[PDB]
């Protein structure tokens, strides 16, 4: 039903962000390798770009499937017009917050790389910047999982109000 539509969409979108955060942390660790060829640095950037693009494509895939399931429920008469409206707004909100999380993770990765390059110093400064990136990326992933549960929970309570 409608509750599974929203849950599935939220879980997929949040899981794509958790996975992106993990991929970026692993790529930042590889960038810490100290006999890194350029040959590899170029491949690290390419993997970064593909991870960002994959995450946002997969988030959008989950949202588009969910909106199609929502409209099928409207047609089969398993949801009225006001419930469908609440579900579509929740899905738009999910797309907005998950797409923001992906852009933030990408920007923090780009800042980390720069601090690693430009901010020059012992491993200590640099390995600090790694552990900072991992700390920030995990915070974003956690916050998004919490918003995902909370928004679907509140959607269900909105449907009951209706």
């Amino acid at each position: 039903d409608a509750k599974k539509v929203a849950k599935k969409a939220a879980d997929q979108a949040a899981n794509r962000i958790r996975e992106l955060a993990q991929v970026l942390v692993e790529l930042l660790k590889e960038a810490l390798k100290l006999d890194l060829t350029q040959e590899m640095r170029k491949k690290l950037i390419e993997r970064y770009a593909a991870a960002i693009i994959r995450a946002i494509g997969d988030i959008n895939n989950a949202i588009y499937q969910a909106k199609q399931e929502a409209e099928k429920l409207k047609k089969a008469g398993l949801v009225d017009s006001d419930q469908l409206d609440a579900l579509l707004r929740a899905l738009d909100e999910l797309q907005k917050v998950a797409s923001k999380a992906a852009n933030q993770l990408g920007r923090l990765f780009e800042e980390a790389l720069k601090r690693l390059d430009k901010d020059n110093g012992g491993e200590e400064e640099k390995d600090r910047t790694a552990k900072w990136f991992e700390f920030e990326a995990r915070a974003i992933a956690i916050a998004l999982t919490l918003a995902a549960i909370g928004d679907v929970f509140d959607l269900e309570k909105e449907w009951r109000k209706l």
């Binding site: 995990r138 915070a139 928004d151």
Partner: protein, 145 residues
Amino acid sequence: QSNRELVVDFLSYKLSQKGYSWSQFSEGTESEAVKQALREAGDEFELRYRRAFSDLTSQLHITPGTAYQSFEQVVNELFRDGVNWGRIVAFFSFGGALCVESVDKEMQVLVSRIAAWMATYLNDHLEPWIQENGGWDTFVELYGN
């Protein structure tokens, strides 16, 4: 003090469910209704969280030196683009998990700190929305069993 008392009641309950006594680390009936509804909502929130994402406490990075940032960075991102009751439940549940994880790692000193940080964030940044949306009694009407 009502918001402080909600934080303490909720944390005391979540800590008790994970094996710990709040006493180790630190209207009357209308307040019970709000406390009970929030306990039940946090229980349901945590069930949903575990079914989708598995364990919450072990995924929380926290040391005494980074604890304020662990709390602040998550909470600021959670409410970055708005507030609803479900995200307020998430905020309590997150705070409860951060306290359990702190105790699990022998960082008991952080429980009272986190409770204070939660009460301050409720009073300064969520109370306007809460009161505008009917106060905690409306939360009970919507979430209480």
